[PDB]
Amino acid sequence: NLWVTVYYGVPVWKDAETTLFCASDHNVWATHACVPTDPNPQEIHLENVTEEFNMWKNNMVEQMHEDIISLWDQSLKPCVKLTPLCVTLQCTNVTNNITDDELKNCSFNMTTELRDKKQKVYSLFYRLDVVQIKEYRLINCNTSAITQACPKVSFEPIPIHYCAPAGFAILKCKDKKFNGTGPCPSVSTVQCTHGIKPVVSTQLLLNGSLAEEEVIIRSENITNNAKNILVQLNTPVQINCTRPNNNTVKSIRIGPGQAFYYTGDIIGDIRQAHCNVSKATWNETLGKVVKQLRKHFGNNTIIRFAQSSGGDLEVTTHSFNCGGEFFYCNTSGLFNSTWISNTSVSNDSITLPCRIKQIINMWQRIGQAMYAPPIQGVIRCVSNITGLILTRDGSTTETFRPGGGDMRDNWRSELYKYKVVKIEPLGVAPTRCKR
Amino acid sequence: NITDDELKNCSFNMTTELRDKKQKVYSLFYRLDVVQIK
Amino acid sequence: FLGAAGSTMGAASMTLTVQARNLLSGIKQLQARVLAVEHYLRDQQLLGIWGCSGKLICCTNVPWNSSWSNRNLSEIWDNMTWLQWDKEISNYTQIIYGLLEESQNQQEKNEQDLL
Ligand SMILES: *[C@@H]1O[C@H](CO)[C@@H](O[C@@H]2O[C@H](CO)[C@@H](O[C@@H]3O[C@H](CO[C@H]4O[C@H](CO)[C@@H](O)[C@H](O)[C@@H]4O)[C@@H](O)[C@H](O[C@H]4O[C@H](CO)[C@@H](O)[C@H](O)[C@@H]4O[C@H]4O[C@H](CO)[C@@H](O)[C@H](O)[C@@H]4O)[C@@H]3O)[C@H](O)[C@H]2NC(C)=O)[C@H](O)[C@H]1NC(C)=O
Ligand SMILES: *[C@@H]1O[C@H](CO)[C@@H](O[C@@H]2O[C@H](CO)[C@@H](O[C@@H]3O[C@H](CO)[C@@H](O)[C@H](O[C@H]4O[C@H](CO)[C@@H](O)[C@H](O)[C@@H]4O)[C@@H]3O)[C@H](O)[C@H]2NC(C)=O)[C@H](O)[C@H]1NC(C)=O
Ligand SMILES: *[C@@H]1O[C@H](CO)[C@@H](O[C@@H]2O[C@H](CO)[C@@H](O[C@@H]3O[C@H](CO)[C@@H](O)[C@H](O[C@H]4O[C@H](CO)[C@@H](O)[C@H](O)[C@@H]4O)[C@@H]3O)[C@H](O)[C@H]2NC(C)=O)[C@H](O)[C@H]1NC(C)=O
Ligand SMILES: *[C@@H]1O[C@H](CO)[C@@H](O[C@@H]2O[C@H](CO)[C@@H](O[C@@H]3O[C@H](CO)[C@@H](O)[C@H](O)[C@@H]3O)[C@H](O)[C@H]2NC(C)=O)[C@H](O)[C@H]1NC(C)=O
Ligand SMILES: *[C@@H]1O[C@H](CO)[C@@H](O[C@@H]2O[C@H](CO)[C@@H](O)[C@H](O)[C@H]2NC(C)=O)[C@H](O)[C@H]1NC(C)=O
Ligand SMILES: *[C@@H]1O[C@H](CO)[C@@H](O[C@@H]2O[C@H](CO)[C@@H](O)[C@H](O)[C@H]2NC(C)=O)[C@H](O)[C@H]1NC(C)=O
Ligand SMILES: *[C@@H]1O[C@H](CO)[C@@H](O[C@@H]2O[C@H](CO)[C@@H](O)[C@H](O)[C@H]2NC(C)=O)[C@H](O)[C@H]1NC(C)=O
Ligand SMILES: *[C@@H]1O[C@H](CO)[C@@H](O[C@@H]2O[C@H](CO)[C@@H](O)[C@H](O)[C@H]2NC(C)=O)[C@H](O)[C@H]1NC(C)=O
Ligand SMILES: *[C@@H]1O[C@H](CO)[C@@H](O[C@@H]2O[C@H](CO)[C@@H](O)[C@H](O)[C@H]2NC(C)=O)[C@H](O)[C@H]1NC(C)=O
Ligand SMILES: *[C@@H]1O[C@H](CO)[C@@H](O)[C@H](O)[C@H]1NC(C)=O
Ligand SMILES: *[C@@H]1O[C@H](CO)[C@@H](O)[C@H](O)[C@H]1NC(C)=O
Ligand SMILES: *[C@@H]1O[C@H](CO)[C@@H](O)[C@H](O)[C@H]1NC(C)=O
Ligand SMILES: *[C@@H]1O[C@H](CO)[C@@H](O)[C@H](O)[C@H]1NC(C)=O
Numbered sequence A: 001n002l003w004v005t006v007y008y009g010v011p012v013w014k015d016a017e018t019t020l021f022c023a024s025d026h027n028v029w030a031t032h033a034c035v036p037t038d039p040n041p042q043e044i045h046l047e048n049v050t051e052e053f054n055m056w057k058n059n060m061v062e063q064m065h066e067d068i069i070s071l072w073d074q075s076l077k078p079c080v081k082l083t084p085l086c087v088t089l090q091c092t093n094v095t096n097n098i099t100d101d102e103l104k105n106c107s108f109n110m111t112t113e114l115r116d117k118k119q120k121v122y123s124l125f126y127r128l129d130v131v132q133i134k135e136y137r138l139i140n141c142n143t144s145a146i147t148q149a150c151p152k153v154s155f156e157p158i159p160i161h162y163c164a165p166a167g168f169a170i171l172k173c174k175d176k177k178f179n180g181t182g183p184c185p186s187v188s189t190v191q192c193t194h195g196i197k198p199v200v201s202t203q204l205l206l207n208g209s210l211a212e213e214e215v216i217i218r219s220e221n222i223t224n225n226a227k228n229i230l231v232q233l234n235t236p237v238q239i240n241c242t243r244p245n246n247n248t249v250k251s252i253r254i255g256p257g258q259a260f261y262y263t264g265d266i267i268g269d270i271r272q273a274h275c276n277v278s279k280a281t282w283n284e285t286l287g288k289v290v291k292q293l294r295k296h297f298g299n300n301t302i303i304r305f306a307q308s309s310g311g312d313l314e315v316t317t318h319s320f321n322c323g324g325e326f327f328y329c330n331t332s333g334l335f336n337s338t339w340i341s342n343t344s345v346s347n348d349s350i351t352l353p354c355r356i357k358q359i360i361n362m363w364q365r366i367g368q369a370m371y372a373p374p375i376q377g378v379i380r381c382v383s384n385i386t387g388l389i390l391t392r393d394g395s396t397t398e399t400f401r402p403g404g405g406d407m408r409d410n411w412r413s414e415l416y417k418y419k420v421v422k423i424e425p426l427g428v429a430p431t432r433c434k435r
Numbered sequence B: 001n002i003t004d005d006e007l008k009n010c011s012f013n014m015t016t017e018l019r020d021k022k023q024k025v026y027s028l029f030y031r032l033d034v035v036q037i038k
Numbered sequence C: 001f002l003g004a005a006g007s008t009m010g011a012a013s014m015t016l017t018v019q020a021r022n023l024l025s026g027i028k029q030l031q032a033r034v035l036a037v038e039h040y041l042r043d044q045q046l047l048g049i050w051g052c053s054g055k056l057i058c059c060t061n062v063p064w065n066s067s068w069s070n071r072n073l074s075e076i077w078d079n080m081t082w083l084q085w086d087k088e089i090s091n092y093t094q095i096i097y098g099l100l101e102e103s104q105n106q107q108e109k110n111e112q113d114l115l
């Protein structure tokens, strides 16, 4: 004798394919076009909700990859196009009255403000941004269109809060030690997330969150080799980096009100860009990693490391932003170690050789070419180390290499804690009412 | 080589990838897409 | 906003009054406030057809058929929480949705018009 009733109950906890918007806070490329950020002290803790995540399958990563590429292209719109310079550039080595031996002093023609008058000037460039044809073409005039970035915006990661649309909910477990997924018991809900920084690199994350107690290795299929194995780090490592060149930046106007910057001259101490890493700090890191890879591969396994295989240095070496300059730094002195058999496996600083480029291709979108305006003074930027990417290559011996290339894995590295639920508040539970 | 009689073999200049270098090539066109001003 | 959905059953229906007042309160962000306002509409579209016109925790007069997992509906009412029982009755939703419009809303709507 049961008579069904109708409710407005809480259990709505379905999948949420959805849109999303931001809560960020000068006209720097984020543009503050989100909302003013609320103090949102509403991590409402819930009691005993068995819910399993899937960090590898969500649309939050897919939208985040779509947002920033569209947002960073939006900052690229009002800047100077600046493609009259793809001409027959001719250069030589930098002259030093005599010595032995990364710069090219370049003879160069160009238009002026007026349409007919030409301009024979000279400037400097690096190695990897110019190609032999002595005549030297630019590196991208196969197929591109060079574009200057406007010299007022900053490429600094300004953190982005995310908030749910009006009618959905952002969920996060405060629980511990996922294997990527996991039925996390304790959970709290939020309307708005915390601030996440717009950083971008490969082979090493930086300025990120920290771990709980140890390394948390994250993957999908450890028995698959084609995965990108994520490594969460417990304790951050100070990385100092520099471009120790006192450099003079001059300015010209290429046409009708189109300014342009170029490396005029350097004051005279030709150096190489580099980064210091504390040696004894780094060996203390890797002992934690092999401590866990015994548990996932075996007690009698040999953990080897090597460099990247090949490809472009964007794939090979460490991509790295710093303060309006886009470094590329070789990291061969970081994976020259082999840990053996998983049983009884200071005041120093290793230093890496780092290169400088100016013509970039962000997220491999071929055709778009953004120019790097060289800046005056010196370069110093300090960053933590938080995230690592390793790749199991295809006996119990095993070699790992620093993988990377997809920037989605960087955002997935710092958004595994979240999920979003759709809301359908309708419950039909029978009782004995009838009337 | 000789015969009697909708195509035009056209002398033609054009830019290149670089801004200054020119390009003297030839191509073909139809009748109704080109006009006398030879 | 939300709370106590985890470990209770029926006593969660005591606090079904905060669950609506915070609810619903370029182009890519403008998909929001359209499907967000299409929701709270399309259910209240059919909620007026259920007979319960506004917000009342209310009962209809259509029978609960006991073919739909008849399991101790005084006992499971209080102990065994929601999100478990919801999967049990996840299969029989559409059929009740035909019974929301035929029992009370084909017969009984045209029985008060007799006077
Ligand atoms: C990981 O996270 C760390 C910190 O969490 C972050 O390090 C920070 O990096 C930023 C950018 O690389 C640093 O900000 C710059 O700092 C320099 C130095 O400022 C110090 O010294 C001056 C004078 O000695 C003091 O006044 C100042 O208070 C500091 O003590 C500044 O010079 C920079 O400001 C200029 O640049 C900005 C962007 O161009 C402008 O918005 C700003 O107005 C300044 O511009 C002026 O000078 C320019 C010089 O060329 C000129 O071009 C302009 O037209 C204008 O005249 C800037 O504030 C910050 O200090 C770092 N903090 C720490 C603790 O290290 C890492 O960058 C991050 N990792 C990555 C990859 O981002
Ligand atoms: C401008 O400067 C750049 C570098 O700053 C310079 O490019 C370099 O030129 C040298 C000489 O042509 C190349 O050096 C070769 O390097 C290999 C390995 O390092 C050596 O083994 C070579 O020695 C053999 O070849 C010589 C050729 O005559 C023989 O004389 C010699 O006995 C050996 O058989 C040789 O030293 C170097 O490869 C390039 N660098 C690059 C990146 O190509 C360039 O030449 C300078 N510009 C001008 C106009 O000189
Ligand atoms: C490239 O080829 C095209 C065609 O493939 C050619 O254009 C043609 O040229 C001829 C000769 O100049 C034109 O033919 C005329 O056509 C009318 C009707 O068809 C005839 O009656 C004309 O004959 C009279 O005019 C002649 C002029 O001298 C007299 O000699 C003759 O006795 C008659 O009085 C004449 O044959 C034809 O009109 C054009 N076609 C078009 C579409 O205009 C062109 O000449 C070739 N290029 C070069 C450089 O020769
Ligand atoms: C990267 O650069 C930073 C600074 O640019 C380095 O931090 C510096 O580290 C040294 C020692 O590691 C610190 O010196 C010590 O300071 C204490 C405090 O007074 C003093 O008592 C000691 O005798 C010693 O001199 C220094 O203060 C510190 N500076 C800052 C600003 O933090 C860091 O070590 C560099 N890391 C690498 C790997 O090179
Ligand atoms: C653009 O032109 C340059 C001409 O040097 C090409 O550069 C070389 O191309 C060969 C064949 O692909 C490669 O083996 C070399 O490694 C290239 N050199 C460098 C420095 O990358 C380049 O491939 C051309 N690009 C396209 C798309 O045609
Ligand atoms: C992880 O990936 C590997 C290969 O990508 C899968 O291994 C296959 O497993 C089946 C049955 O265990 C074998 O018949 C195949 O021969 C294996 N593949 C190869 C290339 O040898 C493995 O199943 C994946 N793990 C999961 C959980 O899906
Ligand atoms: C690149 O070569 C040019 C050659 O003209 C150098 O320009 C000359 O530099 C000397 C002293 O450095 C000046 O007295 C001349 O006036 C400069 N010429 C012109 C036309 O301005 C230039 O210095 C070289 N680049 C570097 C970095 O040394
Ligand atoms: C980064 O530095 C390493 C230093 O070892 C370079 O690797 C060597 O390259 C030569 C020829 O390219 C080989 O004969 C050696 O066997 C390599 N050693 C190792 C450890 O790989 C590497 O080429 C550098 N990469 C860049 C992009 O500069
Ligand atoms: C790198 O991570 C360390 C974590 O230990 C940061 O150090 C602390 O950061 C918090 C908040 O950022 C501060 O309240 C503490 O005062 C910091 N402690 C010390 C000893 O510095 C550090 O700030 C991070 N690096 C950067 C550049 O932010
Ligand atoms: C060396 O070169 C510098 C600049 O390149 C020049 O000023 C100087 O006169 C030169 N000295 C000699 C001895 O050639
Ligand atoms: C630049 O132009 C001048 C004349 O305009 C010419 O003499 C010179 O050779 C040009 N430079 C190069 C590198 O072609
Ligand atoms: C990882 O966790 C899932 C459940 O979230 C489990 O099914 C799987 O066996 C776990 N794998 C390992 C290696 O612990
Ligand atoms: C670079 O050299 C110039 C002189 O040419 C000097 O004024 C400036 O202070 C130098 N840069 C630094 C960082 O000292």
Ligand SMILES: *[C@@H]1O[C@H](CO)[C@@H](O)[C@H](O)[C@H]1NC(C)=O
Pocket: A283, A336, A337, A338, A345
């Ligand atoms: C790191 O230190 C351990 C002992 O603390 C040592 O056995 C190991 O060889 C060191 N790493 C390298 C690469 O030498």
Ligand SMILES: *[C@@H]1O[C@H](CO)[C@@H](O)[C@H](O)[C@H]1NC(C)=O
Pocket: B001
């Ligand atoms: C005829 O023309 C063709 C191509 O136009 C040429 O290859 C050939 O040599 C010519 N023959 C004579 C006899 O002119």
Ligand SMILES: *[C@@H]1O[C@H](CO)[C@@H](O)[C@H](O)[C@H]1NC(C)=O
Pocket: B011, B012, B013, B022, B024
């Ligand atoms: C094409 O250019 C060359 C020199 O650049 C010139 O001699 C020739 O006459 C031009 N062709 C035409 C059809 O004008």
